[PDB]
């Protein structure tokens, strides 16, 4: 009572199993009908391959009856419902038509098996599915195009030989030569030459003897008109594939050229201009061009949360003020983190300016330099956090909200920063968290010994009724 899942791996393995008989029938049936040496010479081979193809054809009917479908988001495993979904469709008519024998209407001849060509839907489904699964989208795409062109060329080669046989072998210069002649008589020459004739005709090359009869003029004109669309399709598919490979570089190069034009037009200094060009080369070479937020907006909101948690929650938990934090708040802070990139020599923050954000070092090395910018008090590596006190909302301390130290980027660094508003927005839902986070900041300033505990109580937040209660002493 097994039911196949269309998104599963076993269903895709079946698509390859059914597509091979379907592709074999589209290639070999017309060749055996037109080239009589192929059918008679290898009869014992075709008896095995016809039986194997037939058995897989009937097996596809059973698989179609046991393939589930999503109804209300749940795969349907009821045998009755799976049968009613398939039987009333058009594909059931085409599937049964491919398998019903033509015993009523020579049974060994390939012409009675031409109903097998109606099973083409499994072949196109397999190519559609493989395009998504494959790791190389462009190698598969050029291989898929060649296969379609090769089958059309092979079909036209068999049509030309059948037209030559109907008109007469060697009766004029256009048709295939006399097969009574041993030079043209064997099967290897007549298939390859007709393949050679078909390729030249369908790719707008020509180089073939001109037609003689009026029926021959019509066939070549039709082939030239079809072949001008075949060549346009080949050119269009290769040209469109080329555009896709260079699409990412061309978008980035157009950005660099526009920035370069801005710097010369605006008389940007040579030192600043050379650094910006140098910065852009590092981003492309290290594959840091793409924006994380632009990448992940296509994901669903819940699945984007688990992607962001797997990257930032480990480093955010190591922050001292967030050590006692609830796991619910830590999730919201992770989504609120926004990335920053700096070049060598860039100042993350300077002494005495307003600090409104905390930074976490994803990558790169940061130095706590002095005012000179060359004497390094401390070294900050990946996972380090600075500015943690600044995001905490407390009335101005002895030091205040302003920064204490000059943080400079020694090399290119990636930082993730949590802003003041972002922390304040997130903590509104969690009022207990606000008390805990302020308490660690109260204790951290106690570690540095900036203010007294009762002096910090003026800086700390108070309840609205107690603040009114403190004022209730004043009104009287």
């Amino acid at each position: 009572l097994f039911v196949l899942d269309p998104a599963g791996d076993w269903y895709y393995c079946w698509l390859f199993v059914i597509a091979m008989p379907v592709l074999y029938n589209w290639c070999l049936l017309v060749a055996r009908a037109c080239f009589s040496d192929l059918q008679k010479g290898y009869y014992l081979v075709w008896l095995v391959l016809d039986y194997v193809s037939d058995v897989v054809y009937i097996a596809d009917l059973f698989i179609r009856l046991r393939t589930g479908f999503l109804e209300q988001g749940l795969l349907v495993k009821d045998t009755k419902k799976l049968r009613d979904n398939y039987i009333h469709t058009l594909q059931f008519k085409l599937d049964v038509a491919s398998i019903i024998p033509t015993d009523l209407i020579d049974i060994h001849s390939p012409e009675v098996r031409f109903n097998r060509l109606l099973h083409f839907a499994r072949m196109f489904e397999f190519f559609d599915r493989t395009e998504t699964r494959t790791n190389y989208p462009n190698i598969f795409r050029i291989s898929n195009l060649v296969l379609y062109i090769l089958v059309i060329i092979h079909w036209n080669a068999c049509i030309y030989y059948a037209i030559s046989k109907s008109i007469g072998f060697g009766v004029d210069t256009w048709v295939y030569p006399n097969i009574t002649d041993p030079e043209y008589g064997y099967l290897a020459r007549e298939y390859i030459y007709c393949l050679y004739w078909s390729t030249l005709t369908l790719t707008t090359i020509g180089e073939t003897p001109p037609p003689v009869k009026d029926e021959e003029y019509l066939f070549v004109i039709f082939d030239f008109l079809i072949g001008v669309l075949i060549f346009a399709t080949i050119v269009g598919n290769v040209g469109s594939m080329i555009s896709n490979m260079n699409a990412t570089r061309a978008e980035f190069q157009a950005k660099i050229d526009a920035v370069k034009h801005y710097m010369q037009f605006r008389k940007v200094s040579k030192g600043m201009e050379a650094k910006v060009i140098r910065w852009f080369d590092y981003l492309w070479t290290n594959k840091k061009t793409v924006d994380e937020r632009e990448i992940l907006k296509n994901l669903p909101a819940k699945l984007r949360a688990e992607i962001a948690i797997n990257v930032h929650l480990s480093t955010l938990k190591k922050v001292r003020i967030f050590h006692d934090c609830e796991a619910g708040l830590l999730v919201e802070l992770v989504l609120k983190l926004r990335p920053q990139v700096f070049s060598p020599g860039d100042y993350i923050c300077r002494k005495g300016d307003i600090g409104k954000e905390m930074y976490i070092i994803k990558e790169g090395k940061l130095a706590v330099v002095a005012d000179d910018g060359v004497t390094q008090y401390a070294l900050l590596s990946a996972g380090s956090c600075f500015g943690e006190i600044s995001i905490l909302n407390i009335k101005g301390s002895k030091m205040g909200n302003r920064r204490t130290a000059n943080i400079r980027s020694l090399g290119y660094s990636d930082l993730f920063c949590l802003s003041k508003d972002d922390l304040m927005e997130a903590v509104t839902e969690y009022p207990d968290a606000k008390k805990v986070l302020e308490e660690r900041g109260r204790e951290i300033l106690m570690k540095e010994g900036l203010l007294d505990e009762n002096e910090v109580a003026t800086s700390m937040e108070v309840d609205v009724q107690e603040k009114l209660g403190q004022l209730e002493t004043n009104m009287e």
Binding site: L74, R129, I221, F224, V228, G236, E429, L468
Partner: protein
């Protein structure tokens, strides 16, 4: 009557008018250049030229019975339509197209195709039909290919007529380039004359070559022009097909914009395989089931009034079934529809867990959600499509024992599509309707009280403290003002 140009009747007439124009463009040049075709089937041309002239005349009748949009409303006035049409340059071309050459007909010949060459001027009516077909067809790329193939044949058919006309002027059988002598066993027939001439131009214009070399200046100059046309015509074929192919590939890319970029990023950021598998299986679900993701971005294509109508027609039926929105105005419910945003959950995903902050109300468009236990194995109840949960959380009703946290765990069985209304989004909408807030809060009281989630005495203590403070603050507002009025 008066036809509407956007109507089906006017479109059906445009497709009718294609055939007289296509007949005149194709047959008249062939009859002029092939004397065997004109003289051999002279009876059939008298019938078909009368039919084309009749349908050309009926086109001018339809032009006088076609309305136009002035001030956005269709004008059905016969006098105003007629006064508008005769001023147009199309009227001049319509008159010239059917302009009688019958007076000068006999002098050149009893029946001459060149005299009917003025019928070519109705070609703008054919381009209008092709433009109108492209707008409303289901297959815009398949029609563009077929329209290009029609353009290819007409140019090749025209070149074949010019080859036969020049080869007749130079004399048949003079050299290998011109059309062979009719004394040859096959070349006396009219069918061979067209088939050989069409095959000659098909060799050139499709860049095959394989033609006999010319022998004189007229044949040299014809070849130089044909080779240049074959090069410029070939580049038009590649460019049109490469644009069709690029339009096809981009369209499927638009449905699923970024798959490789996410997959590449997850490799660079070393996302764990289990989570990486889930993203890959998510993208497989989109391709197989052809689901859409940027539901909001598609609706930005529509104008704001039409976007609201589309949104209301989809979401108003389920929004009205909410217990707290039962006593709401028609205008208020339509404003709440636009604030709904879609959420999609994979199987086994948790919409909400017990103890989590809840500030949203989820409405189940499709899929099944289960109220699982703390362990998660047993299901208390199953919520199907059209149902909802979390409507108390967006209300902010005083005296609730909920605690602004989720009461029970909700798990998604299968793929579930939900629309959520946040507490903030309801709050901005409610600002325009102050009286509507009070009804929802009152409705919120009843739901909590029936399930015993509101202690009245605990609620009253919150209310009494607030109203005493509100009374005190008004006194405090007096106290600050009474002090400051007498302080100064």
């Amino acid at each position: 009557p008066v036809l509407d140009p956007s109507g089906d009747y006017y479109y059906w007439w445009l497709n009718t008018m294609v055939f007289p124009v296509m007949y005149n463009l194709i047959i008249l040049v062939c009859r002029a250049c092939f004397p065997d075709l004109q003289h051999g089937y002279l009876v059939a041309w008298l019938v078909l030229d009368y039919t084309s002239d009749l349908l050309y005349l009926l086109d001018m009748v339809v032009r006088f019975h076609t309305g136009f949009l002035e001030q956005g409303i269709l004008v059905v006035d016969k006098g105003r339509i007629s006064s508008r049409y005769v001023r147009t340059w199309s009227f001049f071309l319509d008159l010239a197209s059917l302009m009688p050459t019958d007076v000068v007909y006999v002098r050149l010949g009893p029946h001459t195709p060149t005299l009917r060459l003025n019928r070519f001027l109705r070609a703008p009516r054919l381009f209008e039909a092709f433009d109108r077909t492209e707008t409303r067809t289901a297959y815009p790329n398949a029609f563009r290919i077929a329209k290009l193939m029609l353009y290819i044949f007409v140019v090749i058919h025209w070149n074949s007529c010019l080859y036969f006309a020049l080869s007749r002027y130079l004399g048949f059988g003079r050299d290998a380039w011109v059309y062979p002598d009719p004394a040859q066993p096959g070349f006396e027939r009219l069918r061979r004359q067209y088939l050989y001439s069409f095959y000659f131009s098909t060799l050139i214009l499709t860049t095959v070559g394989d033609t006999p070399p010319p022998a004189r200046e007229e044949e040299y100059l014809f070849m130089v022009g044909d080779f240049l046309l074959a090069v410029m015509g070939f580049a038009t074929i590649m460019g049109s097909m490469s644009s069709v192919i690029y339009n096809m590939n981009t369209a499927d890319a638009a449905f699923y914009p970024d798959h490789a970029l996410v997959k590449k990023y997850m490799k660079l950021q070393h996302v764990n395989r289990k989570l990486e598998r889930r993203v890959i299986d998510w993208y497989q679900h989109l391709q197989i089931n052809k689901k859409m993701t940027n539901e909001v971005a598609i609706l930005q294509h529509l104008p704001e009034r039409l976007r609201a109508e589309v949104a209301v027609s989809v979401h108003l039926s389920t929004l009205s079934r909410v217990q707290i929105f039962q006593n709401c105005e028609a205008s208020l419910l339509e404003e709440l529809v636009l604030k709904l945003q879609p959420q999609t959950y994979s199987p086994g995903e948790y919409v909400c867990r017990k103890g989590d902050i809840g500030q949203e109300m989820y409405i189940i468009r499709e899929g099944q959600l289960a109220v699982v236990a703390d362990d998660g194995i047993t299901q208390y109840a199953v919520l199907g499509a059209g149902l909802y949960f979390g409507e108390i959380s967006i209300i902010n009703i005083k005296g609730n024992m909920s605690g602004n946290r989720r009461t029970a765990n909700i798990k998604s069985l299968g793929y579930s599509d939900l629309f959520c209304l946040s507490k903030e989004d309801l709050r901005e909408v409610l600002s325009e309707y102050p009286q509507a807030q009070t009804i929802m809060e009152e409705k919120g009281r009843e739901i909590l009280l029936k399930m015993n989630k509101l202690d009245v005495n605990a609620e009253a203590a919150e209310i009494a403290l607030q109203e005493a403070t509100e009374s005190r603050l008004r006194g405090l507002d007096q106290q600050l003002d009474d002090l400051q009025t007498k302080f100064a």
